[PDB]
């Protein structure tokens, strides 16, 4: 039974060593994917910046005319968007700004 072991040990070595090389090459493959993924993302940001950068001059002049009214209409819209859900509670009072005609004349 001892002879079996010594051959069996060599066998596992030959089997296990081959596995090791797989890991080495497998890892290098992952690096190449990461080299191209980042490269692509870099080119994207460059163009993706020009996009918002190009629109920034448009928004700038459009809202420069009246940034107080733009903030008013935009913030009013933002409230409807933010308060879209029913997870908040508006704790007002019967004399609040909106509740001005809620009192007896």
């Amino acid at each position: 039974n001892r002879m079996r072991a010594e051959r069996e040990a060599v066998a596992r070595r030959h089997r296990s060593q081959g596995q090791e090389e797989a890991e080495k090459l497998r890892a290098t493959a992952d690096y190449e994917v990461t080299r191209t993924l980042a490269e692509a993302e870099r080119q994207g940001r460059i163009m993706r910046g020009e996009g918002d950068a190009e629109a920034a001059k448009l928004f700038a002049d459009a809202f420069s005319k009246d940034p107080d009214f733009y903030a008013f209409i935009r913030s009013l819209r933002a409230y409807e968007n933010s308060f879209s859900g029913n997870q908040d509670v508006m704790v007002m009072s019967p004399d609040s700004d909106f509740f001005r005609y809620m009192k007896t004349p």
């Binding site: 890991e23 080299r35 993302e41 920034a56 968007n81 859900g85």
Partner: protein, 93 residues
Amino acid sequence: QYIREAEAYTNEVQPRANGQAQRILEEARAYKAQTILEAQGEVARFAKLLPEYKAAPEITRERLYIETMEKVLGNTRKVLVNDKGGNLMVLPL
């Protein structure tokens, strides 16, 4: 048999450790390559966007601020309660 099986286990695990070593070594290289390239892309975005902000700082700041607020406000639990009444509890989970 315990000794015979023991030698197999020792000889089997040692090559596997070497393979794992290269994997973590290679992953660090990929991280380094990804971070440098990713930084370059972000730098370009900031470089192109910076002159636009300098042209209209208040409008750009206000536009970005309102937009930013809307998203963080939409995904949170707004309260809108007079700060006077600061009597609340955490109730964690």
